[PDB]
RNA sequence: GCUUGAGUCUCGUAGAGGGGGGUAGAAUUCCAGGUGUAGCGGUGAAAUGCGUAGAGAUCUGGAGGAAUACCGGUGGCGAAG
């Protein structure tokens, strides 16, 4: 409907997935799409190429809004995160800045006991 | 008998030493919302499980429990824990 020209992107980046969702600095969501929502499975769904395709299916999914400026909130380990930031840059968005917003607890809770092979 | 051992008094310095009572910010979880769709989750690959009664993701508000990131250093205190 309307125009923003400067939105916000959020790349949740797990070791198993990398979901990318956009809003306009208001929490009112606009467009979301996952690396897993495109037929990919197994290790294939955890590749930076899956990140590229995901970026493309958000970029096309936002053409009506047509923002020309982006800020990216990269969170969590990213295998595919490393390449997602420049795919959007090429998708017709002059990314202003990147920000590592990975939440760090002040020893609030006991973490789960990780893999023990 | 004596004052060197051992004790007492006057004056200050450092400290995660101990007990009790207050309070604070991140973080996880749940609930109430607003937006928002087909996925989420995990794996060697899957499956159980979760999702159209609207999940996952995003912003706001609330509730409860536990512990206090950097400072931090084989640095400090304590008879040991």
From Swiss-Prot:
InterPro entries: Ribosomal_uS11 (IPR001971), Ribosomal_uS11_bac-type (IPR019981), Ribosomal_uS11_CS (IPR018102), Ribosomal_uS11_sf (IPR036967). GO terms for molecular function: rRNA binding; structural constituent of ribosome. Gene3D superfamilies: Ribosomal protein S11. One of its GO terms (cellular component) is ribonucleoprotein complex. PROSITE patterns: RIBOSOMAL_S11. It comes from the Bacteria. GO terms for biological process: translation. Keywords: Ribonucleoprotein, Ribosomal protein, RNA-binding, rRNA-binding. Coiled coil: none annotated. Pfam families: Ribosomal_S11 (PF00411). SUPFAM superfamilies: Translational machinery components. Part of the 30S ribosomal subunit. Interacts with proteins S7 and S18. Binds to IF-3. Belongs to the universal ribosomal protein uS11 family. Located on the platform of the 30S subunit, it bridges several disparate RNA helices of the 16S rRNA. Forms part of the Shine-Dalgarno cleft in the 70S ribosome. This is Small ribosomal subunit protein uS11. The gene is rpsK.
């Amino acid at each position: 409907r309307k125009q923003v020209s400067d939105g916000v992107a959020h790349i949740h980046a797990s070791f198993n997935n990398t979901i990318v969702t956009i809003t306009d600095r208001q929490g009112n969501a606009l467009g979301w799409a996952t690396a897993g929502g495109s037929g990919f499975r197994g290790s294939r769904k955890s590749t930076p190429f899956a990140a590229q395709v995901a970026a493309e299916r958000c970029a096309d999914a936002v053409k009506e809004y047509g923002i020309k400026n982006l800020e990216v909130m990269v969170k969590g380990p990213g295998p595919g995160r490393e390449s997602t930031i420049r795919a959007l840059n090429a998708a017709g968005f002059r990314i202003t800045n990147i920000t590592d917003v990975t939440p760090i607890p002040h020893n609030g809770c006991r973490p789960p006991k990780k893999r023990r092979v």
